[PDB]
mmCIF file of C-alpha atoms in Angstrom:
data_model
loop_
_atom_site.group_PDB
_atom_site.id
_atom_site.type_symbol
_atom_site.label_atom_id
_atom_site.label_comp_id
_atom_site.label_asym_id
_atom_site.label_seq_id
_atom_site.Cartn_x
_atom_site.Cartn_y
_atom_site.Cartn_z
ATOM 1 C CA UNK A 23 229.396 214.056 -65.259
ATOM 2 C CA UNK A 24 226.485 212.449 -63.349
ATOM 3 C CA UNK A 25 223.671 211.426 -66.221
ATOM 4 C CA UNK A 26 220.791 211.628 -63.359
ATOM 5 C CA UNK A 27 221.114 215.023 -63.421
ATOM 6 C CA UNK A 28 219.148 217.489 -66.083
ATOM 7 C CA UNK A 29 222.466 217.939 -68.145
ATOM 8 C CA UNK A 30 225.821 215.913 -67.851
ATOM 9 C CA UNK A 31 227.305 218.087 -65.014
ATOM 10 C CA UNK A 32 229.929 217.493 -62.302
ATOM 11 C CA UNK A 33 229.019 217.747 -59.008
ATOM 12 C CA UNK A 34 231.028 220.912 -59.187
ATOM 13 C CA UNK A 35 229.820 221.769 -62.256
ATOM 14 C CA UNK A 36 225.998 222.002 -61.039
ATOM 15 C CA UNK A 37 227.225 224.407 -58.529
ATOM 16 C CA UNK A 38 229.161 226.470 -61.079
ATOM 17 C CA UNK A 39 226.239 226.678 -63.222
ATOM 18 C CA UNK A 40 223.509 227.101 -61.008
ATOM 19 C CA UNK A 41 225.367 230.127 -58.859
ATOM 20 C CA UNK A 42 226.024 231.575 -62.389
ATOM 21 C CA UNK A 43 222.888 234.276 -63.653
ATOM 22 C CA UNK A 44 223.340 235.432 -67.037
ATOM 23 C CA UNK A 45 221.195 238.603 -67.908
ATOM 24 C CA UNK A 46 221.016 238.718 -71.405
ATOM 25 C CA UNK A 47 218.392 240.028 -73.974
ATOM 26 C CA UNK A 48 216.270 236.890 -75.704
ATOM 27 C CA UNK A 49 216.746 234.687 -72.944
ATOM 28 C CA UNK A 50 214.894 237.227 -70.901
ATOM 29 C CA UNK A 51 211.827 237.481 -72.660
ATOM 30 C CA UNK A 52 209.091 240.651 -72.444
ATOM 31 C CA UNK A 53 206.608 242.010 -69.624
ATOM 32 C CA UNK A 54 203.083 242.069 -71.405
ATOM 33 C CA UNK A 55 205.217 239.707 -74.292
ATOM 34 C CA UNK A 56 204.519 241.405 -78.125
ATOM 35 C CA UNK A 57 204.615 238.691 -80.201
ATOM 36 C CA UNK A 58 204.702 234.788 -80.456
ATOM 37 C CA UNK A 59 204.732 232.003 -77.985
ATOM 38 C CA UNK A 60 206.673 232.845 -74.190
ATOM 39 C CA UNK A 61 208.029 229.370 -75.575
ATOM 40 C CA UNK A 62 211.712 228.690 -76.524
ATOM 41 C CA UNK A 63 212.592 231.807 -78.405
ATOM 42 C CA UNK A 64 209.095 232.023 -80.234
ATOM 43 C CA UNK A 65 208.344 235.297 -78.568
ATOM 44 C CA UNK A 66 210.414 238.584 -79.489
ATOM 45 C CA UNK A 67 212.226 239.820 -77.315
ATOM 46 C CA UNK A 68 214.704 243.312 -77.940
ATOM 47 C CA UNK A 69 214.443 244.743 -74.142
ATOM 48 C CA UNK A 70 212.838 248.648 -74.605
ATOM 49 C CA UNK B 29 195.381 271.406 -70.814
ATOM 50 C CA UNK B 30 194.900 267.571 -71.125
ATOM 51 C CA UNK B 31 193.839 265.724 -68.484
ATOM 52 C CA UNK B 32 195.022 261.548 -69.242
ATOM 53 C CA UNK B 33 194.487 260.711 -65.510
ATOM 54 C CA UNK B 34 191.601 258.253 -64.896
ATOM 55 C CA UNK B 35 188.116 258.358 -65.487
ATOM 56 C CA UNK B 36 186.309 257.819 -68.874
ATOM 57 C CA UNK B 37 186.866 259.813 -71.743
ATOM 58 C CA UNK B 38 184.346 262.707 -72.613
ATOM 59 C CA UNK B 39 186.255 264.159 -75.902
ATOM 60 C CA UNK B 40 187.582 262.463 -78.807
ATOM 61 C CA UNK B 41 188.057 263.143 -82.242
ATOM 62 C CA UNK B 42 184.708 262.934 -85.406
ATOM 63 C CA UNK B 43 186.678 260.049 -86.441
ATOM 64 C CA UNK B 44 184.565 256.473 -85.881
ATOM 65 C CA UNK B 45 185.636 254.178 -83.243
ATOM 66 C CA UNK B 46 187.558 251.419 -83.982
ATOM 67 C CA UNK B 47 188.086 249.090 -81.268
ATOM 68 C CA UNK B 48 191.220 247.331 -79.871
ATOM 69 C CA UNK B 49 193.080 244.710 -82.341
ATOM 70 C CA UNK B 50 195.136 241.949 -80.169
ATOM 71 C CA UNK B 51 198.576 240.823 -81.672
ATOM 72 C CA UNK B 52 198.944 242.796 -84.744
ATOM 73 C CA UNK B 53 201.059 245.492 -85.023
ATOM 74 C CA UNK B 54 198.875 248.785 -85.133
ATOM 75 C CA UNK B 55 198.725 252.931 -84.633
ATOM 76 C CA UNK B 56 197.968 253.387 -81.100
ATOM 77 C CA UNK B 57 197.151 256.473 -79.614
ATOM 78 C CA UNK B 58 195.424 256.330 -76.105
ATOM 79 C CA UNK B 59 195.642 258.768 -72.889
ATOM 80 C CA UNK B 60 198.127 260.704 -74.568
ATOM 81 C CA UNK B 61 200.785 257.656 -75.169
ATOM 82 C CA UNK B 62 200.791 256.817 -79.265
ATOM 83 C CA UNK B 63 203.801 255.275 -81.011
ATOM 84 C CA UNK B 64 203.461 252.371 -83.469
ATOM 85 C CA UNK B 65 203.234 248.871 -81.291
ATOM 86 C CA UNK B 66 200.839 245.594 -80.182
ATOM 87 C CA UNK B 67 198.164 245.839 -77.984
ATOM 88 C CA UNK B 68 197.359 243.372 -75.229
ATOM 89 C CA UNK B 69 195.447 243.510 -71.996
ATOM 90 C CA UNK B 70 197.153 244.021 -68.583
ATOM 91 C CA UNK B 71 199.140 241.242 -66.695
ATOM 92 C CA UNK B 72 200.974 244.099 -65.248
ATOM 93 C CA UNK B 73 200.227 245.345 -62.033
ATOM 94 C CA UNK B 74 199.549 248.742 -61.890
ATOM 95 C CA UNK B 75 198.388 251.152 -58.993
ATOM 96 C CA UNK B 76 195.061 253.474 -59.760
ATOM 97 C CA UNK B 77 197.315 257.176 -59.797
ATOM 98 C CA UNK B 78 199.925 254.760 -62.234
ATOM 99 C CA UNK B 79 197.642 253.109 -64.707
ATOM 100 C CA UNK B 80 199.494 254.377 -67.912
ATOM 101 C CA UNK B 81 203.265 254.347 -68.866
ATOM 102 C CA UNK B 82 206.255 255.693 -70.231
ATOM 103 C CA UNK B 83 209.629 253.955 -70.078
ATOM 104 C CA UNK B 84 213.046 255.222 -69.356
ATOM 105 C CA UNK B 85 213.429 254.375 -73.315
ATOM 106 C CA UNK B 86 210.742 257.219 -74.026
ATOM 107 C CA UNK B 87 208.052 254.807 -75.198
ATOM 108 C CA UNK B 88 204.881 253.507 -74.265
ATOM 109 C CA UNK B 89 204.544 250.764 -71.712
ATOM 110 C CA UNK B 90 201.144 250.838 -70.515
ATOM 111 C CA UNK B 91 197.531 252.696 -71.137
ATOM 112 C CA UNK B 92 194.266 252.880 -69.632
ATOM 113 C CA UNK B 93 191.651 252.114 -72.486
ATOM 114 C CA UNK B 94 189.532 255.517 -72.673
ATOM 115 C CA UNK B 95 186.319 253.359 -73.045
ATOM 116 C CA UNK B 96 186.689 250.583 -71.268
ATOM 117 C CA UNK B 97 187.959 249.749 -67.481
ATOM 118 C CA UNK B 98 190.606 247.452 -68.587
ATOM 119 C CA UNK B 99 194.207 248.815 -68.582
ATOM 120 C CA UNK B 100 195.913 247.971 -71.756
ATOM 121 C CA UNK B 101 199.768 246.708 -71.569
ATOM 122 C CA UNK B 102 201.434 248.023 -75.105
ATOM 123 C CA UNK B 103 204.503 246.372 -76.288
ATOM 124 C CA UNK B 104 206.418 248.080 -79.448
ATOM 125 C CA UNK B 105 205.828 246.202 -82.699
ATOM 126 C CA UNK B 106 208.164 243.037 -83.620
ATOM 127 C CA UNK B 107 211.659 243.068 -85.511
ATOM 128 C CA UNK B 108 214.135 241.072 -85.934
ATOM 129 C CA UNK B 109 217.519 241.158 -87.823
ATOM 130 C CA UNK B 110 218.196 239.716 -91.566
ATOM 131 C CA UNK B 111 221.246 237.280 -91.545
ATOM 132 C CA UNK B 112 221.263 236.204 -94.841
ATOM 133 C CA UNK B 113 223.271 233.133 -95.777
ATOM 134 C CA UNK B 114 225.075 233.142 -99.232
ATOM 135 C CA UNK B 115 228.416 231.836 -100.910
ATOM 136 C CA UNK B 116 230.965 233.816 -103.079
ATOM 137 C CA UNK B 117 230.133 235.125 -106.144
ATOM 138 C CA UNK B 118 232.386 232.705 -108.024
ATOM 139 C CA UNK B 119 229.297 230.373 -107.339
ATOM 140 C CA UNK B 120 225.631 230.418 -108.276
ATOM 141 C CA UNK B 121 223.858 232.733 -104.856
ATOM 142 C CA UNK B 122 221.719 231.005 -102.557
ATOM 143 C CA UNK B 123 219.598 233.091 -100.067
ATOM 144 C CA UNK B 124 218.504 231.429 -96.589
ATOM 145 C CA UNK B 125 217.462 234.148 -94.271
ATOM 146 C CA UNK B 126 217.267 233.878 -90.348
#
């Protein structure tokens, strides 16, 4: 781990994080939002 | 025939007008796209033959106002699931809910 960095990642775990997109439900959050903050996880978010 | 394309609206029903109510979960019903959801005002872009919305899920998306010029962007009312956490029954219950 190198402590600089945002979390305690590798050199070669930076890479295998940040060329690794998740798609999931909740951490995308709405278009046009609902309700609640686009903050952390304070706006809903259940895709259609 | 119904025409829901743009331009202002000329018939409604003898029912008083109630105006547009931002973050609360109301009955919407507006260029021919209803369904039970929060209103907001448009961040999406839209072009002027595309300025209302259904979704491959068969719900409203978006919805030009039939009084105003603004274009409305409708999102389906909040849910959310109830994970309730409680011990046996071979202890007194507790309820916490997520």
């Amino acid at each position: 781990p190198d402590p600089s960095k945002p979390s305690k990642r590798s050199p070669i775990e930076d890479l295998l994080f940040n060329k690794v997109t998740l798609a999931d439900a909740g951490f995308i959050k709405q278009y046009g939002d609902c309700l609640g903050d686009i903050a952390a996880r304070d706006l809903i978010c259940a895709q259609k | 025939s119904f025409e829901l394309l743009h331009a202002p609206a000329t018939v409604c029903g003898p029912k008083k007008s109630t105006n547009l109510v931002k973050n609360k979960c109301v009955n919407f019903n507006f260029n021919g796209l209803t369904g039970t959801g929060v209103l907001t005002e448009s961040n999406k872009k839209f072009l002027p033959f595309q300025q209302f919305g259904r979704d491959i899920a068969d719900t409203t998306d978006a919805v030009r106002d039939p009084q105003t010029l603004e274009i409305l962007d409708i999102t389906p009312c909040s849910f959310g699931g109830v994970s309730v956490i409680t011990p046996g029954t071979n202890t007194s219950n507790q309820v916490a809910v997520l």
